[PDB]
Amino acid sequence: TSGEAPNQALLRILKETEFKKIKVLGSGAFGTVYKGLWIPEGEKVKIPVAIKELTSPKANKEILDEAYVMASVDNPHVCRLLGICLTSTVQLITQLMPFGCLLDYVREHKDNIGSQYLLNWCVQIAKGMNYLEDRRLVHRDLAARNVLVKTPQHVKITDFGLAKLLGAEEKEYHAEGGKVPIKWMALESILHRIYTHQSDVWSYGVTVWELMTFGSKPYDGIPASEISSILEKGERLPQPPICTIDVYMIMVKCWMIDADSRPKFRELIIEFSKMARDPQRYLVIQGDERMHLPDEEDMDDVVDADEYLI
Numbered sequence: 001t002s003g004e005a006p007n008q009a010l011l012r013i014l015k016e017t018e019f020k021k022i023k024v025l026g027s028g029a030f031g032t033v034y035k036g037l038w039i040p041e042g043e044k045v046k047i048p049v050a051i052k053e054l055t056s057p058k059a060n061k062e063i064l065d066e067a068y069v070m071a072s073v074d075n076p077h078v079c080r081l082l083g084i085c086l087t088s089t090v091q092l093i094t095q096l097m098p099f100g101c102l103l104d105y106v107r108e109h110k111d112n113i114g115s116q117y118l119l120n121w122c123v124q125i126a127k128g129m130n131y132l133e134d135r136r137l138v139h140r141d142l143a144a145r146n147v148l149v150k151t152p153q154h155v156k157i158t159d160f161g162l163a164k165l166l167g168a169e170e171k172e173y174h175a176e177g178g179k180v181p182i183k184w185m186a187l188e189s190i191l192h193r194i195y196t197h198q199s200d201v202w203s204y205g206v207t208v209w210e211l212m213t214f215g216s217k218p219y220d221g222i223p224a225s226e227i228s229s230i231l232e233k234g235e236r237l238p239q240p241p242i243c244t245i246d247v248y249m250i251m252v253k254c255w256m257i258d259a260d261s262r263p264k265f266r267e268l269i270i271e272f273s274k275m276a277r278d279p280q281r282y283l284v285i286q287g288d289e290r291m292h293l294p295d296e297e298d299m300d301d302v303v304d305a306d307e308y309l310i
């Protein structure tokens with residue numbers, strides 16, 4: 001009948017014996033993440049990987065939903081699923097992002113982050129979000145904590161546990177009850193549980209505010225049950241001190257009540273790319289012009305996953 005295109009994505013199932021040097025990397029609401037070495041047999045390659053797990057049939061169902069979404073994405077600024085491992089519990093395997101999430105990175109390196117890096121990150125995140133929109137994918141959980149740092153010059157979008165695939169001709173996603181990041185959601189999402197690419201645009205604006213404040217908590221101290229009425233009165237996140245009106249105006253446009261009046265991700269790319277050409281004209285950072293950002297036996301055959309294809 002009618003519908004979409006066949007999702008001919010490949011789901012790689014990896015043997016447990018192909019993973020070495022598994023060390024814990026962090027745990028939390030996302031589950032627990034390990035780091036390790038994926039060594040495909042017959043291939044003189046060692047690939048640094050991260051391994052994620054939430055053994056309930058509930059958890060296995062949700063982790064497979066995320067695998068489906070990630071196996072269908074291929075973009076330099078979106079985390080790529082290398083495969084799944086079918087052991088006691090189902091694990092996801094992805095490229096190792098050695099610098100962690102961007103929220104922790106900007107907090108740790110506040111005094112060595114310049115306008116060039118900040119505006120470049122805004123370009124890359126908008127490029128990934130625009131790609132997800134091209135695949136008719138609403139992320140529904142865009143935040144600085146869900147952006148990972150491959151290198152200081154290269155970031156990728158992660159965590160697709162809330163992501164939904166909009167059908168053709170379908171414009172919105174009507175969610176149900178469940179814990180949702182209220183301080184990153186558009187008002188129509190908080191009020192009516194409606195999510196679109198334009199509601200992701202709202203979350204993009206909050207994510208940019210996170211970076212421009214070097215990792216400040218949005219509405220710090222406000223209970224989540226108050227965010228709805230505060231947004232309805234017209235209140236928004238304040239202008240960060242390093243932000244010119246040019247950059248802050250872009251954030252304010254992401255928080256418009258009219259979802260169609262918010263900028264498109266393809267437009268966020270264009271605007272931030274212009275500003276990244278003259279970064280000190282749009283971000284005012286103390287000492288910006290004087291800032292720098294960056295095993296052994298494995299080294300010989302270590303290859304990053306971005307250079308390991310099929």
Ligand SMILES: COc1c(Cl)cccc1Nc1c(-c2ccncc2OCC(C)(C)OC)[nH]c2c1C(=O)NCC2
Nearest residue numbers: 025026030033050051052092094096097100101158159
């Ligand atoms: C969804 O993609 C993945 C797949 Cl398939 C498989 C494994 C991990 C991810 N992604 C995530 C990493 C991560 C990914 C890659 N390398 C390093 C990382 O960091 C670990 C840590 C704990 C320091 O977090 C900053 N971290 C997080 C996620 C995530 O999903 N939600 C929030 C925390």
